Amino acid sequence: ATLNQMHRLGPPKHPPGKMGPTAGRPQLKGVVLRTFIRKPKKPNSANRKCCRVRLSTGREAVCFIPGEGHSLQEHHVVLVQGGRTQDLPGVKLTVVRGKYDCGHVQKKK
Amino acid sequence: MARKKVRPRLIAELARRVRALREQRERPRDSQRYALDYETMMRPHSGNRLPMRAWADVRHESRLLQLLNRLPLFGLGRLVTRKSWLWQHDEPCYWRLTRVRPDYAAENLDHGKAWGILTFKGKTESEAREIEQVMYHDWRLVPKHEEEAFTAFTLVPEDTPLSVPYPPLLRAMILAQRQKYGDTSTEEPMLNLERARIDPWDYPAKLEAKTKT
Amino acid sequence: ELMAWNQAENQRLHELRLARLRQEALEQERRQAEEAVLQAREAQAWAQLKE
Amino acid sequence: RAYRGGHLTIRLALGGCTNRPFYRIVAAHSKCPRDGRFVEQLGSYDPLPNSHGEKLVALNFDRIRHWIGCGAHLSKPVEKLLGLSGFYPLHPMMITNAERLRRKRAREVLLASQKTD
Amino acid sequence: SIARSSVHAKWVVGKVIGTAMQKTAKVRVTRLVLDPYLLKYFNKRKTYFAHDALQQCTVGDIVLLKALPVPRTKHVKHELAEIIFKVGQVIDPVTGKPCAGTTYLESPISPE
Amino acid sequence: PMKGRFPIRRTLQYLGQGDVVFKDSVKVMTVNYNTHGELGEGARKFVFFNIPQIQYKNPWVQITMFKNMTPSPFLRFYLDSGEQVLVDVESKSNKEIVEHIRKILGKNEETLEKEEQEKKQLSHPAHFGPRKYCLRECMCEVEGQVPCPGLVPLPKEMTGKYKAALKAT
RNA sequence: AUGUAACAC
RNA sequence: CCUAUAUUCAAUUACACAACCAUGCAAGAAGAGACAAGUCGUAACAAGGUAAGCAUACUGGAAAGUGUGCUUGGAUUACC
RNA sequence: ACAGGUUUGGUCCUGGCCUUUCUAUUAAUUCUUAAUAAAAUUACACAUGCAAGUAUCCGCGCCCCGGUGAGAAUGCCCUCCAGAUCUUAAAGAUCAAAAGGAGCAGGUAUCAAGCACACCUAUAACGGUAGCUCAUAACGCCUUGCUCAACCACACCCCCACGGGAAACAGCAGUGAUAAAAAUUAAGCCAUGAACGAAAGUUUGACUAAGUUAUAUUAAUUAGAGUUGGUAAAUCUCGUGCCAGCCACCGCGGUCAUACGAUUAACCCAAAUUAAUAGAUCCACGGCGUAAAGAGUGUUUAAGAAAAAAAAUCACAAU
Numbered sequence A: 001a002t003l004n005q006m007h008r009l010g011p012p013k014h015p016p017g018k019m020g021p022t023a024g025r026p027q028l029k030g031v032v033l034r035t036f037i038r039k040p041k042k043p044n045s046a047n048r049k050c051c052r053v054r055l056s057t058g059r060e061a062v063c064f065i066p067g068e069g070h071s072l073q074e075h076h077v078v079l080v081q082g083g084r085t086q087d088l089p090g091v092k093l094t095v096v097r098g099k100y101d102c103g104h105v106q107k108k109k
Numbered sequence B: 001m002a003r004k005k006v007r008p009r010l011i012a013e014l015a016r017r018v019r020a021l022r023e024q025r026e027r028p029r030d031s032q033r034y035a036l037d038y039e040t041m042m043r044p045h046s047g048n049r050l051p052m053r054a055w056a057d058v059r060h061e062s063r064l065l066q067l068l069n070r071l072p073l074f075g076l077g078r079l080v081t082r083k084s085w086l087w088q089h090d091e092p093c094y095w096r097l098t099r100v101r102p103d104y105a106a107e108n109l110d111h112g113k114a115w116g117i118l119t120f121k122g123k124t125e126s127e128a129r130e131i132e133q134v135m136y137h138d139w140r141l142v143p144k145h146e147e148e149a150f151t152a153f154t155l156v157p158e159d160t161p162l163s164v165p166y167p168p169l170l171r172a173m174i175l176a177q178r179q180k181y182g183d184t185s186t187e188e189p190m191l192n193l194e195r196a197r198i199d200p201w202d203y204p205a206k207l208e209a210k211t212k213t
Numbered sequence C: 001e002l003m004a005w006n007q008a009e010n011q012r013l014h015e016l017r018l019a020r021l022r023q024e025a026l027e028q029e030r031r032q033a034e035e036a037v038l039q040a041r042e043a044q045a046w047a048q049l050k051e
Numbered sequence D: 001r002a003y004r005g006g007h008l009t010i011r012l013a014l015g016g017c018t019n020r021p022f023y024r025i026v027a028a029h030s031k032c033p034r035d036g037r038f039v040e041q042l043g044s045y046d047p048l049p050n051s052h053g054e055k056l057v058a059l060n061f062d063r064i065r066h067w068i069g070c071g072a073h074l075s076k077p078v079e080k081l082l083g084l085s086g087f088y089p090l091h092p093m094m095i096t097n098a099e100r101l102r103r104k105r106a107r108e109v110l111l112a113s114q115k116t117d
Numbered sequence E: 001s002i003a004r005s006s007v008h009a010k011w012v013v014g015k016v017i018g019t020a021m022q023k024t025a026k027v028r029v030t031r032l033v034l035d036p037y038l039l040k041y042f043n044k045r046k047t048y049f050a051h052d053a054l055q056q057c058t059v060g061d062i063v064l065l066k067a068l069p070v071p072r073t074k075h076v077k078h079e080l081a082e083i084i085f086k087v088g089q090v091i092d093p094v095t096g097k098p099c100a101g102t103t104y105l106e107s108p109i110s111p112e
Numbered sequence F: 001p002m003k004g005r006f007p008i009r010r011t012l013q014y015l016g017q018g019d020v021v022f023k024d025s026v027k028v029m030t031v032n033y034n035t036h037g038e039l040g041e042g043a044r045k046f047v048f049f050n051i052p053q054i055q056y057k058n059p060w061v062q063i064t065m066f067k068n069m070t071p072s073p074f075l076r077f078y079l080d081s082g083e084q085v086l087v088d089v090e091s092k093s094n095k096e097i098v099e100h101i102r103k104i105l106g107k108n109e110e111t112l113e114k115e116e117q118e119k120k121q122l123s124h125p126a127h128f129g130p131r132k133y134c135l136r137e138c139m140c141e142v143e144g145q146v147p148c149p150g151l152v153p154l155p156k157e158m159t160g161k162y163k164a165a166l167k168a169t
Numbered sequence G: 001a002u003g004u005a006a007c008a009c
Numbered sequence H: 001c002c003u004a005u006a007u008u009c010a011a012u013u014a015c016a017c018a019a020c021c022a023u024g025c026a027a028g029a030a031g032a033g034a035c036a037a038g039u040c041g042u043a044a045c046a047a048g049g050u051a052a053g054c055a056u057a058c059u060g061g062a063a064a065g066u067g068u069g070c071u072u073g074g075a076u077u078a079c080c
Numbered sequence I: 001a002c003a004g005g006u007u008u009g010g011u012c013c014u015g016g017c018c019u020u021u022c023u024a025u026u027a028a029u030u031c032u033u034a035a036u037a038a039a040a041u042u043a044c045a046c047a048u049g050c051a052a053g054u055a056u057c058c059g060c061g062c063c064c065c066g067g068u069g070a071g072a073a074u075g076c077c078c079u080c081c082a083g084a085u086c087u088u089a090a091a092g093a094u095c096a097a098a099a100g101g102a103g104c105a106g107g108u109a110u111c112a113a114g115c116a117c118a119c120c121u122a123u124a125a126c127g128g129u130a131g132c133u134c135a136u137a138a139c140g141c142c143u144u145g146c147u148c149a150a151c152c153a154c155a156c157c158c159c160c161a162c163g164g165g166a167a168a169c170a171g172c173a174g175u176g177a178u179a180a181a182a183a184u185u186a187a188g189c190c191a192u193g194a195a196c197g198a199a200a201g202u203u204u205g206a207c208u209a210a211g212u213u214a215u216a217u218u219a220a221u222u223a224g225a226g227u228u229g230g231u232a233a234a235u236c237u238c239g240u241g242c243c244a245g246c247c248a249c250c251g252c253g254g255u256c257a258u259a260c261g262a263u264u265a266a267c268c269c270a271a272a273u274u275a276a277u278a279g280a281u282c283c284a285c286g287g288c289g290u291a292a293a294g295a296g297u298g299u300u301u302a303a304g305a306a307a308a309a310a311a312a313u314c315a316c317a318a319u
């Protein structure tokens, strides 16, 4: 790439960042349409607690519930954030614990 | 500025055209513009309430076209004075009326536009000028036998100083600048006031458009 | 005055150019004479063969 | 930006800090905001006394008289400041509120003398 | 003495693109512009219109252009001042002799 | 710059260290030159080296090249008043061309420091405002004055809420 | 022709 | 029209007109990816058991096979 | 970038992803007081209160301050200024429309042709030429305030506002809807600016002084948060046994877990600590036989380089 070609093509400029599953917003409010369990990939085997939610932006998404134990049924409102789950393909959202219809993890009693 | 994507707006020019046409068509007459309700002291046309310092003079005095409409030749060459100059100055101040056009919309014929020759403080100006504050309830009319009584004047010379001392620190720059260039003369610099004469507030301002020279 | 000095400088370089082109004209006449000798030799060589 | 009218004004612009004001002497347009775009900053005025007990004023004399000569209007505090400077004579508002302080403080002396008895 | 133009191009020099239209030549001015990433000067071309009253433009000339004070139209703001180099007929401004590239057409050291 | 035969001439120091500044009436500067022969060596070095510097110091002046039309290289200056200045180069070297142009039409040295002197009068030290145009922002920052309330808190007796409390009581 | 799915320095 | 001024009008006419798209849903069709496991074969990696591969045509459940040119990203082990 | 982790039984090279650094919003946990700075979900609809008045009547002001970024690649920089205002006999000063251009200016060429985008004449009209922009990016499409003493645009919508939808807070406060996003339906013109008046002076939800908020710095009145496999500072005992679960990447958990949950201990910040999302920064003046890259071949236009010196031309199977 000689000087004439670099003058013709201009300096290299960085591309803008692709928007994530939350469309650039940090959290999103959603209502739970369904809850289920989902299998992981090759290196490890489990069945993690996930949910299918209708978000406030109108798009329906798959989210993962962290922690151990939850009391969630349908028509519950949750707050989700853009953390991705490494084991599960297609899951790019995590419910934040301690907001709306979901609480923190319960200590054993 | 100018760009290659400018689009030909027509409605703004058309709206300015229709607005100018409508104000030229429905320009308000002076009678309906300046008719007054004498109890509320509130203008039916403009919605404005009169100031309280002009409250007494509305009920206690009549305007120029209220005192002029009964004159036989509709007041040409007549002298009309004002309560403002009568109360503040001992010297007579009067206007010699040149030409007057009333408005016909008033059923009592109490409104119009008038011109005249100015005499203020006894000094007579040589040009005709449209009369300001015709509509004020503050005008008075002199009699014919008192016309030459108010016409006669005793000219008094002015005792104001034509030159004053400078403000002190500006005077210090004048002394410093002449000492810098070597002017030995210690004469006191004097600010001259022949262009500083200020005509006071009740002079009527010129409502005619000034020609740019 | 700078226009006048520039005009004088251009005239001086013009005289230098004219003198040097006289030298190269003399050299070009020398090369023309030598090329004429070589052309005459090759023409007289080519004339014998066709005969 | 473009305005319909207005005039050139030499005035005081309030910048600075909370409970620590500062006025910049500013020759600008009349219709612009107080801290908006200006033509020329002439001087400064410190509203607070220093450790030396001085209120400190700076004026750019030639530019101020140039702007007044080409027709810049002045506001009441900057005419007060120029009157204290002596580039202009003393402002009659300073004159009258000075005599008002004389009358008020003399009346306070009389009231204190009556309240002593 | 008010004869001024609002354009920054008071005097420019351009190569003629074409003479298709009547009494006006399309000319192509070349300027040096600093590309700032490379810090290097390059040739930027721009198109202008110039009024030729005598129709003296052959395509390939180098033409001096002077700015008109009040433009006739939005695209013709310049006129020819001089034909600097006629195409194929180039006289040297130093010696006053016609030349063809590198070779002199007539020798300047031969007045007679 | 790694690319290029002479990479040093593409730096900001070389573009800024060339000192030829034309007069304000100068509009067009035209170089006719040849790429053959030992005579045009100085003109070719002039084109290869100094014209970026002159174009940097005169951004509004047009500079134009022409190659192989006239047997002798020359430079031609077109002014505002229709004035045409011809500088003929046939054997002059690059530095002699530089001093020759700077002596025929440049800017005088005294005009240069006076031009930057009325350029330096625009930034007066006594003004206040942003850092990009003025040296100081607060009057607080001056050593003898009141310190700024974001750094040193003010005494209570100066404070407006205490003034309102004492006025209301 | 084939032999899947849990190796750690 | 012996000072000098007053009023009017400013609205239509002739056609095309959801074509063009963008956003959601859908009877359905086709692909790709992921495929801790099932069935069918073993195509390729060793002259992978027919040397592989490219362009292209035909054929076959499927990897694929064959035909005409081209390549070594294959050897022929080198007084054989 | 002073770099580091990560491909493979293993080494070297190429090449992506992530960590380490700084700032801003939201959420979680915690929270003692002050000062300063800032208040930021919405061009969706608004109950109510105020925010333009002054002045001897005429007049003068009435998106001027202030609010917002919806639209437009709008635009930055530079010439020339009609017009408005101020002071004055002139003439100067400020704002500067419209008009342009030396130059700079988001992405996309899977937007490559646009379709009349042009010129003369002498009179402002008849007519005649076949023209104009464009691969150094026209004409299109998408997105967006910005290059910041600041600049541009909007005043419910139909780019405009004659007219029609229809009764307008994108003023200060506040209310619904919506959003992850939560300031007082508050005191004065005491100080500066603006408006008016000859003037004492009047008004000002601009502003000044406060109220609320860990949003950010400072001082102390204050002690909680995160983490302990490697990068990367720091772990002991129990319970579980590819289950529950954790992670930024490599990855760990399959009855002896420094990686899960709890306890002890330790590390690092601190009235803050993490998580998420945006930013700042970060790609090529480096390469093209084997890793991505020399396009199947030749000629030419545009565009360049000609820099010091020479040459074209002979058996054999071009077509």
Ligand SMILES: [Mg+2]
Residues within 6 Å of the ligand: A083, A084
């Ligand atoms: Mg995580």
Ligand SMILES: [Mg+2]
Residues within 6 Å of the ligand: A098, A099, A100
């Ligand atoms: Mg909570």
Ligand SMILES: [Mg+2]
Residues within 6 Å of the ligand: none
């Ligand atoms: Mg809450």
Ligand SMILES: [Mg+2]
Residues within 6 Å of the ligand: D016, D017, D018
């Ligand atoms: Mg402040």
Ligand SMILES: [Mg+2]
Residues within 6 Å of the ligand: G002
């Ligand atoms: Mg099998």
Ligand SMILES: [Mg+2]
Residues within 6 Å of the ligand: none
């Ligand atoms: Mg095979």
Ligand SMILES: [Mg+2]
Residues within 6 Å of the ligand: H047, H049
């Ligand atoms: Mg075999």
Ligand SMILES: [Mg+2]
Residues within 6 Å of the ligand: H042, H043, H048
């Ligand atoms: Mg096989």
Ligand SMILES: [Mg+2]
Residues within 6 Å of the ligand: none
């Ligand atoms: Mg085989």
Ligand SMILES: [Mg+2]
Residues within 6 Å of the ligand: none
């Ligand atoms: Mg077989």
Ligand SMILES: [Mg+2]
Residues within 6 Å of the ligand: H051, H052
């Ligand atoms: Mg093989």
Ligand SMILES: [Mg+2]
Residues within 6 Å of the ligand: none
């Ligand atoms: Mg094939």
Ligand SMILES: [Mg+2]
Residues within 6 Å of the ligand: H059, H065, H066
């Ligand atoms: Mg077969």
Ligand SMILES: [Mg+2]
Residues within 6 Å of the ligand: none
């Ligand atoms: Mg067969």
Ligand SMILES: [Mg+2]
Residues within 6 Å of the ligand: H074
């Ligand atoms: Mg092989």
Ligand SMILES: [Mg+2]
Residues within 6 Å of the ligand: H077
């Ligand atoms: Mg061997």
